[PDB]
Design a protein around this ligand. Structure first.
Ligand SMILES: [Mg+2]
Length: 269
C-alpha cells in the first residue's frame, strides 16, 4: 500500500508563528504530490513534556484530524515520529475579528448572519458527540474565504486565574468551572454578538472581575446596532442563567437558517 502520512521532507519550516500550549508553532509550506504549495502552521510538542501532555497533544490532533467539517479548521497531517509535527492549514485572511474590523464599511448584515450560521453548524456537529469546545470567539475563528469561516482549536483549559476568557463565559463556567454543550451555547451567542458588532470585545467597558456581578443582576450585552432584532432575541435565550433553558445548537441552526433566508429575501426588496 502507498505511504499514508505526510513525509517530513514535504514540509519546510520558514519562521516562528508563536508559542502554543504544548510548544512552539512554526509557519511552513507543505508540498503535496501534485506539487502544489500549501501554507501550513506546524504545531510541536516539547520533547521534555510529561508523557501526559504528550498524550493530550496527540489527542487534540486526533480530534482535529477526524472532525473533517467545512466550518472547523483543517488538519493536513500528523508526523508522529519525534519531533512530532501537527500540520494545520494556514488561512491567509486570518482571524475573523480582525477581518470584520477592516471590512466593516463594506460588509452586509447577510454575511454576518451567514458566518454565525456556519459556526453554528460546526457546533451542532460537536454537540451531537457531546464534545465541548470552550473557545467560540472571533479571535478563534479563521477566514478561509469571504464565503467560509472555520472554528479554531479547542479551548486550552481541557488539557487541563489561567487568563480565562471571563467576558465570553457562562455563569456556571465562571462560578463552578462547569463546561457543557449548554455553556458552549452561551459562548456561541457571545461570538454572535462579536460578529454582529464587527469584532467588538464583549463587556469592553468592564474589568473581568465586574462581569459575574453584572450577569447576576440580569444585565446582558446590548443589541448591536445592525443586529436583526430576531437574532438579539436568540442571543438573549442563549444567555439564560439556567443552562437547561438555553436552546440546543440543533435548534439554533434551524433558527439561524430561517433568519438567513429571511434576510436574503428582505434584501431584494
Ligand atoms: Mg428559567
Amino acid at each position: 500500500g502507498p505511504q499514508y502520512g505526510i513525509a517530513r521532507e514535504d514540509v519546510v519550516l520558514n519562521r516562528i508563528l508563536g508559542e502554543g500550549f504544548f510548544g512552539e508553532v512554526y509557519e511552513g509550506v507543505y508540498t503535496n504530490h501534485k506539487g502544489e504549495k500549501i501554507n501550513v502552521a506546524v504545531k510541536t510538542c516539547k520533547k521534555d513534556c510529561t508523557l501526559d501532555n504528550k498524550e493530550k497533544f496527540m489527542s487534540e490532533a486526533v480530534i482535529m484530524k477526524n472532525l473533517d467539517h467545512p466550518h472547523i479548521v483543517k488538519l493536513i497531517g500528523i508526523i508522529e515520529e519525534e519531533p512530532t509535527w501537527i500540520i494545520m492549514e494556514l488561512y491567509p485572511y486570518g482571524e475573523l475579528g480582525h477581518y470584520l474590523e477592516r471590512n466593516k464599511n463594506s460588509l452586509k448584515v447577510l454575511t454576518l448572519v451567514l458566518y454565525s450560521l456556519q459556526i453554528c453548524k460546526a457546533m451542532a456537529y460537536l454537540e451531537s458527540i457531546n464534545c465541548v469546545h470552550r473557545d467560540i470567539a472571533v479571535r478563534n475563528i479563521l477566514v478561509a474565504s469571504p464565503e467560509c469561516v472555520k472554528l479554531g482549536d479547542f479551548g486550552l483549559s481541557r488539557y487541563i486565574v489561567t487568563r480565562l476568557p471571563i467576558k465570553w463565559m457562562s455563569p456556571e463556567s465562571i462560578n463552578f468551572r462547569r463546561f457543557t454543550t449548554a455553556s458552549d451555547v452561551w459562548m456561541f451567542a457571545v461570538c454572535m454578538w462579536e460578529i454582529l458588532s464587527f469584532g467588538k470585545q464583549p463587556f469592553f467597558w468592564l474589568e473581568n472581575k465586574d462581569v459575574i456581578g453584572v450577569l447576576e443582576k440580569g444585565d446582558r450585552l446590548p443589541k448591536p446596532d445592525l443586529c436583526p432584532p430576531v437574532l438579539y432575541t436568540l442571543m438573549t435565550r442563549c444567555w439564560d442563567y439556567d443552562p437547561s433553558d438555553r436552546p440546543r445548537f440543533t435548534e439554533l441552526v434551524c433558527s439561524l437558517s430561517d433568519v438567513y433566508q429571511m434576510e436574503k429575501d428582505i434584501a431584494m426588496e
